Every structure is written in structure tokens, then in C-alpha cells.
Design a binder for this molecule. Structure first.
Ligand SMILES: [Fe+3]
Length: 54
């Protein structure tokens, strides 16, 4: 699945991994993350992520 980078801190949201410690099971697409999910490292909103693809 896809990877998305936090443009602030460099954390990668990997859809295959999810973010279980913050309520997100593996295989959750970025677009399916709750509106108030934030970068687990720096707190940036979803607006500050970019999909890693061309
Ligand atoms: Fe971040």
C-alpha cells in the first residue's frame, strides 16, 4: 500500500503498518484516517502530508 511523508518532521505513515498505538489498524489508507489524526511524532495535521509517488 502507499506511504505518505510528514513534510514537517519526516515521519512516514505506511498504510501497511497503520498506527496502532493511536487507534489505527494496519492496512488503513491515509484517506480513511480520522479528520483529527495527526502526525504521531510532531503533531502536524493531515494537510502537511504528501503521498510518496510521482
Ligand atoms: Fe510530523
Amino acid at each position: 500500500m502507499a506511504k505518505w511523508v510528514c513534510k514537517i518532521c519526516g515521519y512516514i505513515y505506511d498504510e501497511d503498518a497503520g498506527d496502532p498505538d493511536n487507534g489505527i489498524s494496519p492496512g488503513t489508507k491515509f484517506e480513511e484516517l480520522p479528520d483529527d489524526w495527526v502526525c504521531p511524532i510532531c503533531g502536524a495535521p493531515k494537510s502537511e502530508f504528501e503521498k510518496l509517488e510521482d
